[PDB]
RNA sequence: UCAUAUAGAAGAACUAAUGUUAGUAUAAGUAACAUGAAAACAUUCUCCUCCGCAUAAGCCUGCGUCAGAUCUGACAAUUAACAGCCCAAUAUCUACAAUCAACCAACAAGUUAUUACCCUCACUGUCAACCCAACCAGGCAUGCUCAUAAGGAAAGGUUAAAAAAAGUAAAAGGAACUCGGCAAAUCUUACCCCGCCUGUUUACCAAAAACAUCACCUCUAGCAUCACCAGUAUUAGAGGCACCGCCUCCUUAAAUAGGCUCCACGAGGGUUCAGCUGUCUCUUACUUUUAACCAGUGAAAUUGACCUGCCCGUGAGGCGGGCAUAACACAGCAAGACGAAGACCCUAUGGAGCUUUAAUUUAUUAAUGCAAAACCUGCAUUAAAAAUUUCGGUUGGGGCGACCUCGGAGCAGAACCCAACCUCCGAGGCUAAGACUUCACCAGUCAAAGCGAAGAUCCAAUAACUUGACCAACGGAACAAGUUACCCUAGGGCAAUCCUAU
RNA sequence: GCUAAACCUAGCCCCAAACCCCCACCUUACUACCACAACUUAGCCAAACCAUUUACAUAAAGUAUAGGCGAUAGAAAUUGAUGGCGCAAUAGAUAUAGUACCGCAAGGGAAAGACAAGCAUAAUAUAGCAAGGACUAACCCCUAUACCUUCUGCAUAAUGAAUUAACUAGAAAUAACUUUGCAAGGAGAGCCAAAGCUAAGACCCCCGAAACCAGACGAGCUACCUAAGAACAGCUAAAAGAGCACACCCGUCUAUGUAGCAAAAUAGUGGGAAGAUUUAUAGGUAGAGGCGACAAACCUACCGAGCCUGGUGAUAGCUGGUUGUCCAAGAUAGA
């Protein structure tokens, strides 16, 4: 026979049926939405069209992203967007020589980074690209706060983002006690990434963590029906009395 | 080389034959040297009543009226259990009418069940 | 050739022919006398004259190449300044 | 393979412990070194090589007297049970060590070389030039790793500022800090070379087996 | 002489083909799942 | 749609794939199998067993009763003291063997103090003629009985043919048998080759002269907590060799057989003395199984159909020409029905290998060298380690060796064409009617007039005008050899020179 | 006359629509009850080898483009979007069932329910592909070298068939030809058009390798190793891989057996039998890998490379087959 929905619509169907159905709207929107990562390992074609030399006509061109592997060890660091390139090469860079296996891996370092909204020093593994992006962004905090989920591609980075966004949203005093002026300075410096708390709690959560959070949020000890029935009795008795 | 027939205590070598029970509850624990200590508390003491003078028998005469199936529902129980006390006291803060808010300080807990049929 | 493509299910042409032969619309095929560009220094002038020519292909070759090319390459083509515009048609053919 | 290596003891004691053979099998399960397996069951005596170890809450050079000098399956030399203070230790003995002898263990570098008895433990610098030493250590406070086998003499060659050059039995030199503690003499069980084992059964008893292959 | 390669032993049979040995590795869970799918009523030895 | 016809459709037709499934045949009522004797069914007798009893392991009700049949159902059972199922924590300790354990002699070197607890016997195995071998002269650990206190039955009945199997006896002779004294009977001797010895190996054709082995020698390695190793140059790993000492003409009557030193040993190989014997000269008798007959139960390979003869000829039960010839069981035999697994030669642009100085690679590792922030990342070079891949054609007798394209002379005497590893030698100006040709194509060849002057394709360098090597296996894979005695699959299989007589 | 022969439905196939559903149980699963963890398809296969390469709405278009520019691969812009000429018990699902049974395991995987052959009634009579011409007459007379497939024809040269019943093997484009519609236009958009277009009709099989690659299952047999156990009478000799010889282990030579008692046994004769011995029990090593006192020996009866599932209907210039009637044309230059 045949299903009533294709195979790739099953995920989107599941996101509407059960516990996943009660998640807040904005989290679902942030989850379903897809964005292409910024190019990292390939030179993107500048324009939508191009003249090729072999014939001379105006042919369309697209940029097809290289597929890159992120081993789980990166999820504990900030690799930027970089990663492994698993593929093949021609031996002598001539097409008539053997097709050989090849893996290109980034050059990783360990370093220390100071987060001001967190006022904490983290030890993180990174790559030269991550340092250059941080410098171009004028600080680690800005780099983690303005970059979107897709370019970071690091659960650690998204957790940092959730912490910083929650710290800004609450305006909680725990950043720098005994100097509120420094608190106000730091908080207002990043005043642009100020989103409400209800949206701050869910930033970066994977789907499973979201389901667990919703369950814990709604799980509750059933109310004794004694209270319910006595309430109904009291309502009926009051109605009878006022009549 | 037989895998369809059930697996029971009569099957393996000495060790298996000993370990595997036969659905029978335990009542104690093994101490040192394969010595068994029984506990008087883990042995179900039956509670049989005094049947003397009882006017009911295993069966009921065929000369009995029929009736309708009315299963007891929480509402039905509440209706004649506590409601009349409420109404009598409604003419002039819930534990006084039998409500039990928590179930740690009673011998027969209702949820979870700490007693037996 | 490929009588049915895996992705569409149509016939497919052998592009090694398109780059070698020209189909005059009404049947004939014209080629270019292999051996003509290279080694032109020990060939007699008459031989060089022969090799430059555009020659026709006999019946079996024409039927073969008709098989190796789909319908698109047999249509009626109205090109602006076609050096072969006048050869598309036979005139006064007896049998 | 569930292979918890037997060398799991942490506390030190003179009582033999229960060896488990390997047969050449490493933790994975494959023949890593061919030609090993079988042979007589053995127990292991934890021979202590830091021959200058002062007992709890004590210091300064200490004297110990031996009790017996017995065969040992694992070694090639003959171990000896030395008693000192309130402590017994298994230590590799030299050739001319009899039950009842006494031995000194010191870290005290004297003004000049102290004539040392043929079983005592002294820092390299403390010895004179041209003597024979055993149980040398690469660096101080580490333990004896170099010469330990049966009947092997290690000559001391020279001393310079803060270091000493010693000659290992393999006919080559090495430098070590002058505060490294060695023992003067020749390791016991001399002429262990001349052991004609006679028959393949003896090889099997020791632990070796004949293995073709070794790809 | 051959043919008697099966020297039965309950310990071995339950150790190298049993429920827990299958469930102690992804391949074994795949085996159990195949035999659940095909309908078998003897999933594990 | 008429309601067998006119149309439209389609899993649309089986004398044949060692086709598949089911039925029944043939060989065939053949091969093979089974129950010690008498009886009064209570019993007695004859004979046999390295067997029996128990635990373990395995199996799971698998000869208990009753009732139906020649196995089905119901009912019943194996009672824990034996065996399993264990342990409160922490620190401490825990040097000396076992061998009747004492003498000698060795080497392979073999639990408690404190803290916490005053609780009692629950749960499971318990049967049998049994398990692994499809049902079975096979396999099956331990304790005890060592010929049995326990357990069993080698002959369904008969007769005493052949051939076969096992055994007993044998006149005279005693290896004349034979490849060989294999088998059997008897128990002795001597040497030679190989290997030092005990051991190990081709489960299912090789137990050896092969492997291993003490002894010797060579090469590598200066050292921590997962092997070597809780080891350290008299150690560890990897190789060669094989202790130790010494060096780097007789035989027979007759004969192609036998005749670095080096004790001991060998189901190793060869030879010899003496004896022994049915091995033989030369077989014979008896017994047992088989056998043949009666009764019960009852297969399998094989089979185109058969109404299934001999001789000669052709190229043989079946054709031809002669001969023979009423039908039918039963037991034998092995000349014929090319009577029903295993080899050998050749082929495949089949498969899988092995070695390489056969082609391609360095992806992985190891060294370096260069950039990257004391270690990892990227690039390059060098090597080992591997990885993918192939084995042109004609042929003495397949191999060796030559040749492989084009051209000229006889075969092919007189249009054209016709083979050769048949016969003899070399070569690597433009435009345009019409035609010829190397038996295809691709190439190749001649050419009036007219106008002007007198060895393929693809690739790279190219503005170009076009250009080249290899492709000589010369219709050309862009770059691939030696070999398979371990191989696997698909398949094919009227004599120049001479011998002799008239 | 037996044996049989017959039957219908139990169900199933392809569509459409609709998004589908008390107790015990991860230890030895189905056991009331104590201190680690998951995150590029290679290759069979084509190129007639093989090495780069090789596929996973309609139209534009098999066009641009890619490619040992070979085999082949191949876009986009834009366009517009309850039923059955199905099976009916060897069919249809493998199904009454993933059960029985086979295998240690992964895994494999059934059958079936409602006067055909073979025989009997009734053995045969010279002689012969078992028939034909016939004959008053069954035989007797004359004629007469079985069938399929493969080799030049084959006497059977070779291969295949005991026999009956059921099931079992020609799927499609490019042109052309025939018949219709319309015809300088055809076509229900895209395409063709110098009589063409649109529609229909006709034509391209089955079984079979050794292999390759991927992921699972296997060391209850055997090779080796680990932990903790067990056995070795008697005699001779006293600390020895000692001698003779039981239990135990092996398997020298001969005979029996060869569908056997046994897919390697039996009887005798033999080697070892306190050791490098033999052995019960649990664990380990996993397939180009393990192990190996090297024999290409062994890794569950078949190992110069296990077994199972998948890619897989692998490929096969090779072998074998290929089914109604009747007629007609129809054969040996060569590169
Ligand atoms: Mg009809
Ligand atoms: Mg058909
Ligand atoms: Mg047939
Ligand atoms: Mg017969
Ligand atoms: Mg018989
Ligand atoms: Mg009991
Ligand atoms: Mg007990
Ligand atoms: Mg019993
Ligand atoms: Mg008896
Ligand atoms: Mg009998
Ligand atoms: Mg009889
Ligand atoms: Mg005689
Ligand atoms: Mg021997
Ligand atoms: Mg021998
Ligand atoms: Mg009979
Ligand atoms: Mg003849
Ligand atoms: Mg006969
Ligand atoms: Mg060929
Ligand atoms: Mg090949
Ligand atoms: Mg000529
Ligand atoms: Mg010719
Ligand atoms: Mg020509
Ligand atoms: Mg002229
Ligand atoms: Mg060629
Ligand atoms: Mg040629
Ligand atoms: Mg190919
Ligand atoms: Mg069926
Ligand atoms: Mg079926
Ligand atoms: Mg009939
Ligand atoms: Mg014949
Ligand atoms: Mg046949
Ligand atoms: Mg084992
Ligand atoms: Mg095929
Ligand atoms: Mg061919
Ligand atoms: Mg004709």
Numbering used by the authors:
A (entry chain X): 2 to 244
B (entry chain 9): 15 to 106, 113 to 137
C (entry chain 3): 94 to 188
D (entry chain D): 61 to 275
E (entry chain 2): 48 to 92
Publication passage describing the model:
We show that MRM2, but not its methyltransferase activity, is essential for mtLSU biogenesis, as it remodels the conformation of 16S rRNA in the late stages of this process. In the absence of MRM2, a severe mitochondrial dysfunction phenotype with underlying defects in mitochondrial translation is observed, with the mtLSU being trapped in immature assembly states where domains IV and V of 16S mt-rRNA are unstructured, and an anti-association module is present, preventing premature engagement of these immature particles in translation. Given the functional impairment of apparently structurally sound mtLSU particles, these were isolated from MRM2 knock-out cells and their structure determined to 2.58 Å using cryo-electron microscopy (cryoEM) single particle analysis.
In state 4, H89 and H93 become structured and H92 is further stabilised. Throughout these states, H89 changes from an outwardly rotated conformation with apical flexibility (states 1–3) to one where the whole helix is stabilised along the L7/L12 stalk (states 4 and 5) but its base is shifted to a different position relative to that in the mature state. Concomitantly to H89, the proximal H90-91 are also stabilised in their mature conformation, and bL36m (absent in states 1–3) is present. The conformation of H89 and density of bL36m in states 2 and 3 are similar to that modelled in state 1, and those in state 5 are represented by state 4. Nevertheless, since the conformation of these mtLSU is not similar enough to that seen in mature particles (displaced H89 base), they are not licenced to engage in translation, as seen by the persistence of the MALSU1:L0R8F8:mtACP module.
